[PDB]
Design a protein around this ligand. Structure first.
Ligand SMILES: O=C(O[C@@H]1O[C@H](C(=O)O)[C@@H](O)[C@H](O)[C@H]1O)c1c[nH]c2cc(Cl)c(-c3ccc(C4(O)CCC4)cc3)cc12
Ligand SMILES: Nc1ncnc2c1ncn2[C@@H]1O[C@H](COP(=O)(O)OP(=O)(O)O)[C@@H](O)[C@H]1O
Ligand SMILES: Nc1ncnc2c1ncn2[C@@H]1O[C@H](COP(=O)(O)O)[C@@H](O)[C@H]1O
Ligand SMILES: Nc1ncnc2c1ncn2[C@@H]1O[C@H](COP(=O)(O)O)[C@@H](O)[C@H]1O
Ligand SMILES: [Cl-]
Ligand SMILES: [Cl-]
Ligand SMILES: [Cl-]
Ligand SMILES: [Cl-]
Ligand SMILES: [Cl-]
Lengths: 281, 362, 159
């Protein structure tokens, strides 16, 4: 494949920007402060450093916030005492017990293809780039960045059949955040489309929209509907559209996944940035 | 009976540079002329400039800019070191300006662009030629500028300032005459501004027989702008001759200035630092040493304010270095700066620093 | 090639040496220095000077006294003497400084990508900067360069 050969040649480094910011958290940091720091710094994921281990043990992302929130929400009347007073490691101990998952990483000199493969290989969205002489984490490689790069160099959806179209995880307008978070946990998918009284799609609650709870300090109430939640702030595609023009749509709007819908604006499936880079590997 | 080096017959002494005589060389056959800097090994070892020259050669041997004198080859002998370089008939730009008057807006602009391009090349190569003057700007038969004495030049290393107070006091930056610390290019800009004034006016902007008032003027950044001077270039000089390096024109801001841009040829071109304590400097340094050993960290005392400390990693079993330096901020306060020394590196550096801070003054 | 310089006055000065079968070679005078340059094989060579009717040696240069009491200068032209960097390596054998304003020009405080930052002046790289310890947690930061790119890493560390 022409795309696959081009990715096999380009070094990760070529995608690292001129001057970037990196936020690293010591595992002994109180996990609440940890999420609050993501919001304040304007970052979606951060590497973790165990001082006793003297190495990067993992990554702290929004899924971790979703996970805690769901595993530990009791009600709006009580504090998530757990979240409020728990360290990153105290929770990493709980979250990953007899089930163990090491740190996944790439080298700047390592291939772009090698990196794209590593994301699907370990089923992740954030990849830390580490230089082996320094051991220093330099950048966090994301699907959105790799795709914007491939699309920068690029000079039907029903025929190629790309994306997930069967047993699609979605919520209603009325659905509480807690319920929705529980879905993100059981299904393990980036976003959930919001459907009306009819199967038609009105909005979309993303793994992202879950940070506003951290940001606005509103996580203490998860009984609130998904629409109530999304009030702080739609994009669709059809099966009768070319992949080149559909890839073009995702990067021009800088969206992590597009909705495959019918004429009556009723859900048919979803085509993630994930699936795209895979089909091109 | 002709004295030769390479196949060039050593002729007349063109001048005496920073570290040695400069003589003409006319090729045995072709008649080609070269500029030959003679560095006596025994003398370059007397002044402890042996390292300086090693670096100077290294840099200049890989540089290739049209407005910087080319270093053809360096010939070593048991006795002396011969730097074969490009010869230019025109000689000092200084004498040009002495002989002829000041240059016309058009002619001056050309030569300023030419000079600045080279100055830029240097910087773009971590080299900062301090001592930049009309006396070190040479001209060829076609009136093209040529930067020449890299004896006072220095390197720019990530995280360090230079101290040496180099060059003629007329062209010397206020911070250089002040003997304060500097990054490097700002002091080359301050000189280039003086060069620009000299081209346009044919005199020096800061100049007096009374040396203390020459210095007052420099630190007061005050110079006279003659009535013939174009307000746009006056503007450029006002920006280039700032006493504050933080407020001074950058090689980019000059490039962007409309006077410069005109007919310009294509060929050219809530955070806190460290910890701040109000104690007596001697107490501060004693406190750092009594805390560094309180962490079992190996160190070397450079200055009574510079300290090079090393730490053994208890896990990865790897050495990690850092440099500690005290500066005077206020007339009332001081601050301990932490610099990382290159051989996770960055994280281990932070940990190293952190430990100290928790047991230290603001 | 080796340099032969006679420092001190004279009308006529010559170099006799083992290299030129002790023939009188005339050194050209510039000023108070009389010089000649000639390549000699990597070996031992003895020489003397014929300075205005008298035969001398440079007292400052190494000599050798003969079984016959002949005093001549000596020169061991070493392999190392030929190559510049080989020779330069062989040749090598208060008040607190004021705070440079540069170290206060940071890239974090001063729509757009929050991860993306301005390019720094080389002078502020590897320097430790920190934020006030609020909530018993220290926040350290530093900009480091890897190749032609830069990374400002900030550690959230409890104390
Ligand atoms: O002049 C020298 O040193 C000076 O010593 C002074 C002192 O104390 O004596 C200082 O004051 C002064 O600053 C210093 O540079 C030299 C050091 N090494 C040398 C090697 C050579 Cl080959 C020549 C050389 C080259 C061509 C001609 C000719 O002109 C070509 C025909 C004769 C003549 C002589 C000169 C030197
Ligand atoms: N490189 C990595 N190494 C180890 N664990 C990781 C890595 N990246 C993410 N994780 C973990 O994978 C899980 C899912 O994260 P992810 O899908 O990448 O987040 P998000 O979609 O919000 O960016 C989390 O438990 C996170 O801690
Ligand atoms: N709402 C959804 N329901 C079901 N699958 C989905 C949904 N959103 C994304 N996916 C799939 O989840 C996988 C991982 O993608 P993502 O987490 O969206 O980056 C891909 O195979 C997607 O097609
Ligand atoms: N198909 C879509 N249509 C509209 N908004 C979307 C869509 N997909 C994601 N978003 C929004 O994109 C933002 C960032 O989410 P994420 O794409 O996971 O980074 C959120 O505000 C989402 O609601
Ligand atoms: Cl001179
Ligand atoms: Cl001639
Ligand atoms: Cl010429
Ligand atoms: Cl002048
Ligand atoms: Cl002598």
């Amino acid at each position: 494949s022409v795309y696959t050969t081009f990715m096999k040649s380009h070094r990760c480094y070529d995608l690292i920007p001129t001057s970037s910011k990196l936020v690293v958290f010591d595992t002994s940091l109180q996990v609440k402060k940890a999420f609050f720091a993501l919001v304040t710094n304007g970052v979606r994921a951060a590497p973790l450093w165990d001082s006793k281990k003297q190495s990067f043990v993992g990554m702290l992302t929004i899924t971790d916030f979703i996970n805690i929130l769901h595993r530990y929400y009791k009600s709006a009347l009580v504090q998530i005492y757990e979240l409020e007073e728990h360290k990153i490691e105290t929770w990493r101990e709980v979250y990953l017990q007899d089930s163990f998952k090491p740190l996944v990483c790439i080298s700047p000199n390592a291939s772009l293809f090698d990196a794209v493969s590593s994301l699907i290989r370990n089923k992740i969205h954030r990849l830390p780039v580490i230089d082996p002489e320094s051991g220093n984490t330099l950048y966090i490689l994301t699907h959105k960045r790799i795709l914007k790069f491939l699309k920068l160099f690029i000079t039907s959806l029903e025929e190629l059949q790309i994306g997930t179209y069967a047993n699609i995880a979605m919520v209603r307008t009325t659905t509480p955040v807690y319920v929705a978070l529980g879905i993100f946990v059981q299904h393990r998918v980036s976003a959930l489309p919001v459907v009306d009284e009819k199967g038609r799609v009105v909005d979309i609650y993303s793994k992202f929209d879950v940070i506003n709870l951290a940001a606005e300090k509103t996580y203490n109430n998860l009984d609130v509907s998904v629409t109530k939640a999304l009030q702080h702030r739609v994009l669709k595609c059809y099966l009768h559209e070319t992949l080149e023009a559909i890839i073009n749509r995702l990067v021009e709007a800088e969206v992590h996944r597009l909705v495959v819908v019918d004429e009556h604006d009723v859900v048919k499936g979803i085509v993630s940035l994930s699936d795209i880079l895979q089909a091109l590997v | 009976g002709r004295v030769k080096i390479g196949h060039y017959i050593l002729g007349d002494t063109l001048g005496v540079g920073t570290f040695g005589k400069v003589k003409v060389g006319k090729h045995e056959l072709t008649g080609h002329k070269v500029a030959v800097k003679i560095l006596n090994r025994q003398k370059i070892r007397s002044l402890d400039v042996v390292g300086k020259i090693r670096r100077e050669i290294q840099n200049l041997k890989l540089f290739r800019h049209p407005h910087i004198i080319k270093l053809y080859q360096v010939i070593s002998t048991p006795s002396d070191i011969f730097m074969v370089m490009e010869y230019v008939s025109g000689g000092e730009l200084f004498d040009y300006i002495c002989k002829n008057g000041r240059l016309d807006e058009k002619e001056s602009r050309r030569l300023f662009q030419q000079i600045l391009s080279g100055v830029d090349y240097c910087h773009r190569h971590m080299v900062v030629h301090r001592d930049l003057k009309p006396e070190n700007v040479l001209l060829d038969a076609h009136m093209n500028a040529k930067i020449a004495d890299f004896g006072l030049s220095n390197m720019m290393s990530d995280g360090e300032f230079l101290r040496t107070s180099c060059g003629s006091p007329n062209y010397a930056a206020p911070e250089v005459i002040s003997g304060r610390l500097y990054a490097g290019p700002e002091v080359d800009i301050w000189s280039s501004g003086v060069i620009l004034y000299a081209l346009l006016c044919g005199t020096l902007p800061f100049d007096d027989d009374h040396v203390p008032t020459l210095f007052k003027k420099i630190c007061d950044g005050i110079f006279y702008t003659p009535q013939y001077l174009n307000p746009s270039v006056i503007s450029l000089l006002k920006h280039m001759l700032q006493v504050d390096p933080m407020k001074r024109a950058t090689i980019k801001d000059i490039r962007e200035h409309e006077w410069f841009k005109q007919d310009l040829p294509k060929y050219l071109f809530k955070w806190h630092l460290g910890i701040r304590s109000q104690s007596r400097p001697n107490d501060i340094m004693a406190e750092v040493c009594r805390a560094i050993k309180q962490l079992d960290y190996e160190w070397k005392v450079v200055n009574p304010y510079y300290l090079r400390v090393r730490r053994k990693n208890p896990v990865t079993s790897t050495f990690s270095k850092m440099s500690l330096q005290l500066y005077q901020v206020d007339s009332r306060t001081y601050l301990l700066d932490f610099r990382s020394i290159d051989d996770s590196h960055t994280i281990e550096f932070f940990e190293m620093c952190a430990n100290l801070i928790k047991i230290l003054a603001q | 090639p080796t340099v032969f310089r006679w420092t001190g006055g004279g009308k006529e000065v010559y170099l006799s040496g083992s290299f030129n079968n002790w023939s009188k070679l005339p050194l050209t005078r510039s000023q108070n220095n009389f010089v000649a340059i000639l390549d000699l094989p990597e070996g031992e060579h003895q020489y003397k000077f014929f300075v205005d009717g008298q035969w001398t040696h440079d007292p400052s240069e190494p000599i050798v006294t003969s079984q016959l009491g002949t005093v001549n200068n000596i020169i061991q032209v070493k392999k190392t003497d030929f190559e510049v960097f080989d020779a330069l390596m062989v040749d090598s054998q208060k008040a607190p400084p004021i705070l440079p304003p540069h170290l206060l020009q940071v890239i974090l405080n001063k729509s757009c990508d929050p991860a993306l930052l301005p390019e720094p002046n080389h002078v502020m790289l590897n320097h430790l900067y920190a934020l006030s310890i609020k909530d018993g947690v220290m926040v350290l930061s530093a900009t480091h360069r890897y190749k032609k790119k830069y990374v400002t890493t900030l550690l959230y560390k409890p104390i």
